């Protein structure tokens, strides 16, 4: 199937409580494989997946150096944004960055990403063309002008089409046992009478990997998109995910509802109903 690699970074200032806290994590699909935390006992980039442990000391030193340099650039950038937004130096602010790449089943680049947010709002993003920028406001336009002058988009495109795709391909091969295994959902429907004339039907999906999944309820073969309660997909802690979808149905009409499950670990979408 298709795969992604992402690096996430968060800096949080805390005036009067020291310097900003910096945390960065790396993922292949929904598997965490590396972490760096400025406030750890001995901040170094640490392996979080068995398949990355084989990387040599030169890899770990290069990654640690990059994490430390990014923590520093974020401290500088938090100061810059206080100026660009005419803000007091007294409040706590957040800077987030994500970058990475998506590849298809043949390992070719599907899309590259590089984007930043300030206080949880979009700041500046590299467009899908890997050549132009979306600046959210006139402050981010100042960064856009500097980045256009410095040919930043060209440097990012080179990384995203090159090292990002090739190292993603390397990790997929080294972790093929897990990264290239899809665990289908284990599914069932529960029934909860609500009144004398209604009942809840809840369609459960457990133990699946990757997280992407589609649970839908149909009534007489028609999607119940606007009447379905869909909980956010949630991690179980054993690498797998869980999700449920629920509908409020008139008592006696249960067999007219079918739950449809789509997941990459399933060869065909599944259909299930309350089996009383």
């Amino acid at each position: 199937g298709s795969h992604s690699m992402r690096y996430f970074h968060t800096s949080v200032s805390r005036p009067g409580r020291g310097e900003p806290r910096f945390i960065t994590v790396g993922y292949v699909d929904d598997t965490l494989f590396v972490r760096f935390d400025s406030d750890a006992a001995s901040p170094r980039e640490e392996p979080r997946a068995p398949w990355i442990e084989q990387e040599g000391p030169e890899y770990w030193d290069r990654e640690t150096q990059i994490c430390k340099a990014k923590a520093q650039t974020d401290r500088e950038d938090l100061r810059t944004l206080l100026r660009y937004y005419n803000q007091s130096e007294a409040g706590s602010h957040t800077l987030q960055n994500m970058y990475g790449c998506d590849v298809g089943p043949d390992g070719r680049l599907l899309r590259g990403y590089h984007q930043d947010a300030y206080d949880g709002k979009d700041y500046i993003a590299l467009n899908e063309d890997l050549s132009s920028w979306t600046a959210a406001d006139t402050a981010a336009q100042i960064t856009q002008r500097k980045w256009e002058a410095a040919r930043v988009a060209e440097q990012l495109r080179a990384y995203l089409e090159g090292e990002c795709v090739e190292w993603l391909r390397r990790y997929l091969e080294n972790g093929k046992e897990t990264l290239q295994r899809a665990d289908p959902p284990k599914t069932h429907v529960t029934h909860h009478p609500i009144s004398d004339h209604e009942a809840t039907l809840r369609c459960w999906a457990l133990g699946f990997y990757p997280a992407e999944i589609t649970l839908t309820w149909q009534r007489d073969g028609e999607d119940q998109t606007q009447d379905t309660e869909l909980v956010e997909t949630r991690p179980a802690g054993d690498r797998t995910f869980q999700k449920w979808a629920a509908v409020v149905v008139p008592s006696g009409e249960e067999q007219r509802y079918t739950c449809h499950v789509q997941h990459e670990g399933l060869p065909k979408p599944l259909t299930l109903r309350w089996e009383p």
Binding site: Y7, R62, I66, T73, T143, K146, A150, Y159, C164, W167
Partner: peptide, 9 residues
């Protein structure tokens, strides 16, 4: 593998 490039706002 992370991008080694450093860019400031």
């Amino acid at each position: 593998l992370r991008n080694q490039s450093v860019f400031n706002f």
